[PDB]
Amino acid sequence: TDIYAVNGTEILLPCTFSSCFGFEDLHFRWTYNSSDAFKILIEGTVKNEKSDPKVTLKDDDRITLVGSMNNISIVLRDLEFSDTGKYTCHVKNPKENNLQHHATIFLQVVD
Amino acid sequence: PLRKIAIKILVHSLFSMLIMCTILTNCVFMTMSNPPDWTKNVEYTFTGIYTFESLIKIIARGFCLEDFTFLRDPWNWLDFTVITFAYVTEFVDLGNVSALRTFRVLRALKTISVIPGLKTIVGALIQSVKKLSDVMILTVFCLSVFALIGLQLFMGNLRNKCIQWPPFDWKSYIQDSRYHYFLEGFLDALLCGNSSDAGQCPEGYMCVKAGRNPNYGYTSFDTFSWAFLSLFRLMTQDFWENLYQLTLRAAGKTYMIFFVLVIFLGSFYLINLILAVVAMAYEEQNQATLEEAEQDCSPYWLKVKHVVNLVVMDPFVDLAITICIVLNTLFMAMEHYPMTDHFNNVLTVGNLVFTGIFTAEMFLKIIAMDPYYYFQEGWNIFDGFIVTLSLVELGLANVEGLSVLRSFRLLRVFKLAKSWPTLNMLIKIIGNSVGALGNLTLVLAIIVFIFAVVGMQLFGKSYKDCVCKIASDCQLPRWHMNDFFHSFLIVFRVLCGEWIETMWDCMEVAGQAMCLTVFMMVMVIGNLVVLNLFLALLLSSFSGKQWWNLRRTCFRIVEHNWFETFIVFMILLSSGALAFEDIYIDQRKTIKTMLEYADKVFTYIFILEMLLKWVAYGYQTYFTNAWCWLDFLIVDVSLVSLTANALGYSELGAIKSLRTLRALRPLRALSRFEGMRVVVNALLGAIPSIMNVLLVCLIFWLIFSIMGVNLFAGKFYHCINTTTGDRFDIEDVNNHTDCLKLIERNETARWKNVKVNFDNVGFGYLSLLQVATFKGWMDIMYAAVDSRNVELQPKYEESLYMYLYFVIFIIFGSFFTLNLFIGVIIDNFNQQKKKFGGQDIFMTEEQKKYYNAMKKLGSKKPQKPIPRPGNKFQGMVFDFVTRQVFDISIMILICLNMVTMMVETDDQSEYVTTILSRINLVFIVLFTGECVLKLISLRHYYFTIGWNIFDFVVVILSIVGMFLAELIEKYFVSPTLFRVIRLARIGRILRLIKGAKGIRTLLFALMMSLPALFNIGLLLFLVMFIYAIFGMSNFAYVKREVGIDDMFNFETFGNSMICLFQITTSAGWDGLLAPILNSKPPDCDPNKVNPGSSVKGDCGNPSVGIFFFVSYIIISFLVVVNMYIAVILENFSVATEE
Ligand SMILES: COCC(CCO[C@H]1CC[C@@]2(C)C(=CC[C@H]3[C@@H]4C[C@@H]5O[C@]6(CC[C@@H](C)CO6)[C@@H](C)[C@@H]5[C@@]4(C)CC[C@@H]32)C1)COC
Ligand SMILES: *[C@@H]1O[C@H](CO)[C@@H](O)[C@H](O)[C@H]1NC(C)=O
Ligand SMILES: *[C@@H]1O[C@H](CO)[C@@H](O)[C@H](O)[C@H]1NC(C)=O
Ligand SMILES: *[C@@H]1O[C@H](CO)[C@@H](O)[C@H](O)[C@H]1NC(C)=O
Ligand SMILES: *[C@@H]1O[C@H](CO)[C@@H](O)[C@H](O)[C@H]1NC(C)=O
Question: B interface mutation test: which of A18, A21, A92, A100 has the most B CBs within 10 A?
């Protein structure tokens, strides 16, 4: 959906998954899309349903994982107007040949 | 104005029709899986229409503020509920995640409201369901009793696995299921057993009870509830063969006695009683309804039609039409797959010639009755439809997969209904289906739709959100509820009886309670409606000084009492001597030669008896008896083989196959015992009508067989890599030429057929039998639905909608034909029972008099068998114990004991075991006190009525069973014997029949039906014996494919009888026929040294296998239908005579 946040503040962008019978070696990626840019923001792995995520890529130091549900939500702090755009969480389950794209969040940073 | 306009529109048919069309359109809308955006606003308009409806209604019944609005009608409650939920959900939030979406299908139940003529049908269904109270109590009592029995016996047995050995330690090396034996892709943990006659195990695989359970964990005989589930599935014979096999493979073959008992008690008598009570209610229902109803163009056109009219009425021209129809039937029934254009030419030429002559006769005969003056008979309309459609489809030649129109010329076979009267009866019923019974089948269709959408909304998202829990490649299984079509197919399957294999997959993905409730409600409501529709169609359709001196002596001999007894003794011994012909017969050498000598002694004595019969009877009195002919035929067949083995023709292509003719020897007992002779007479007296109806059923199946040959028969071929039995995808192999490109490249792809297909009209007759018996239709339909095209590789569900062909057949050729058969059976049995003037066939001449004395034993009651205990403290004891309060307290006590017997559970602690043993000891002591005290209040007899005697017995047995529980720890020990002896306490539960007067009546009808079923059981046992020896001679060396394994095969008499009893219910015969239909490599190896015999070859002849199994299916079907009728005609005469 849509989300409005004030310049200079922080915003939590949510992503929860659930597994009917757990998982192994889950991979996740958050992306950002604007009219002229694409960024891979953060990537990581989750060994199983009893493990915490391990981040393997983070390309912005203003992003942190929220910590745990079956939760890979991120907090983006010190917002700038250029942060306006589309944020999407992708979750891949190689063993189940499964890839889920969560609904894109349009973040609008405002004055 | 205000109220005037409102009350007027309400009672006009136009508004009702509007609401009805809106209801139906919303029904068609809710069918979708993920309705798009616009559908939304469509639902908004639907809510607005329902709002306006309810608004009109409230303004009508609650105008100008009168104290309330429309509320007495139960359907108005439903309307109010749905509109309330609709405008309560409109409110922004009611959960978010959403679970209430299933509630919306309630607006689709509003059908029953307006459809003029459905409220009476539902209210009359409920009135028929009311009668089943006592039968339900009985069936739950018996299910519970037998569930306790299976609990105590097979306590945890179903967990027995086959653990291997490793490369301080325990309870962690018995799990993980990696050290267990998996029999080549079965995903279930092959079972084992310590005992002999139980499931064996490979080298280095010991038997330790450790793991989950069979299936998914839902199959076990521990934790009562699961035993109730398993014995309920055994009551409906729903894949029951899998329980039978998994149990005999873990507890030992000797426990098939329990399965025979369960089957013959529950799966037969409970169903018979349910059906008899439903029919009893239905019958009186219609009786009451009847009783309540009781109180130059035209001139020259006529000139030319003159002569042609005076041609076709007098000759045998419309009989030539008949023979032309019958010959076109044969011409279109000669189609197959292969064919050489030198045959397809004849085919198409004859088809064009028949179309030609028929349309010519049509265009000629049409001008003898004036058009419009011709479309009035009904048959002429149909003839015109056929001829037109025939001419249309002729010059089109474009329909891709829509070549079905080549089968529309097949309907003209119904023109025989003019002369053929039984086909006319069948058409009458299939048209009454949509006529006088159109609203009831509309109710049934509504119900199927409601269930198909309820299951699709409740469990629909789950089948996709947790696929990998019931799957191998994380893809939807063959049957699911993701979309409406498959969800309807599952409801149809459940209506066919196959409700458990999908219930496991439901519970595994959507919670046990939710799937249990939905599936039980489905298989109760839907089967009740289907049975009501069946009975509705049924009960409305048919509504020398020495030469003469030696004849005297031999005549005294043949009629002597010792002679016939000695001859039947010889028959029984010569029949038993056949059972010892196992595979091990060439490994005894001490019983083999004695059997060889006995085979000749029996032949000679059975020749001597035939000679004595000849001499003492004369050829005229001999050869005019069916039984003497039957006996002489067998001695003739034996004489042929004797002269063959005596002259020198030792082993030939015939005499080798004449040794298997000894299997017919048991038939000599049919003329000795009245029990089997009476049954044989009763079947031979009614076989002609069965033949007459079988003709109609065979033609009606020929129709569907030609249809299947046209749609199928060439697309069932597929290449699989023989290393894993897999399916070669369309991306890899497309058709025949690609697979023959692979084989030439020295690959392992098998261009294989299904071996039960539609390639001919013969194989069609066989596929249709599996589809109509519901045993084997799975592979047939998985090959028919993937039927892409002839000579093309079949792809997974490309021709998906062909399921409708099998649905249409299962309706027409299985429901309606069986209805007609039951109808004609009722008719001919009525005529039979009328001609005999007497009663009760299937009974002998002495069983009838023992039946007469029990019919008097049933109708009476005792009167004051209690003088008193004269004058003592025994007087007041008698005052205290005889009253009703003590009698009802003992029943509450027995119910409590039953409750503490339900708490038993595999793998419970010692604490719980101890307290349970203690409380059972207290119950034993309390009932012992009961009886012993009762021996002081009635201390002159105590022993008049049988119930206190049965109490005495069960008390004695419990005292024994507790007295040796300490003998098991000091003297002769056996645990499997302890499990059996502890079962004696269940006899206490059987005292519950004392007070529930009404369940006793049904068991008394059981006692009545025992002596008439005994004879038929003996005859079925004899047929089972004959077929067992036939299989042990023929099938005892087939390959061990899907249906035949080391535990259930035809090697010995034991295994053969336990396979024959499985087939007796027609269960699992498709798997047993599957290995036999193999004929030659690369399937078999026809040259096998296979030990313990000279016989070689590892699979049998398809012809003899097909004959065997189909012959036995039909014979067992006739025998079990006469058992059904022998139970039902006694059920009727006890409820009508009370
Ligand atoms: C008209 O007056 C005659 C009257 C009794 C007529 O009422 C009949 C109502 C139907 C009913 C209950 C009757 C006899 C056989 C019953 C059938 C036996 C078959 O068994 C099954 C089960 C096993 C399967 C192989 C197929 O057949 C059922 C489907 C079939 C069955 C249960 C369908 C219902 C039938 C009695 C006599 O009054 C004294
Ligand atoms: C089977 O026998 C083995 C040893 O012979 C024993 O350890 C095991 O407990 C037995 N299991 C059962 C179910 O009898
Ligand atoms: C058949 O399956 C096996 C393993 O399942 C595979 O190795 C083989 O390649 C398959 N056949 C072909 C022709 O690829
Ligand atoms: C089989 O399919 C291949 C795929 O290209 C095609 O080339 C070939 O002609 C087809 N043969 C037949 C008989 O359909
Ligand atoms: C394939 O098999 C045939 C016969 O088995 C053999 O002659 C041939 O050498 C094999 N290999 C090839 C490439 O044809």
Answer: A21
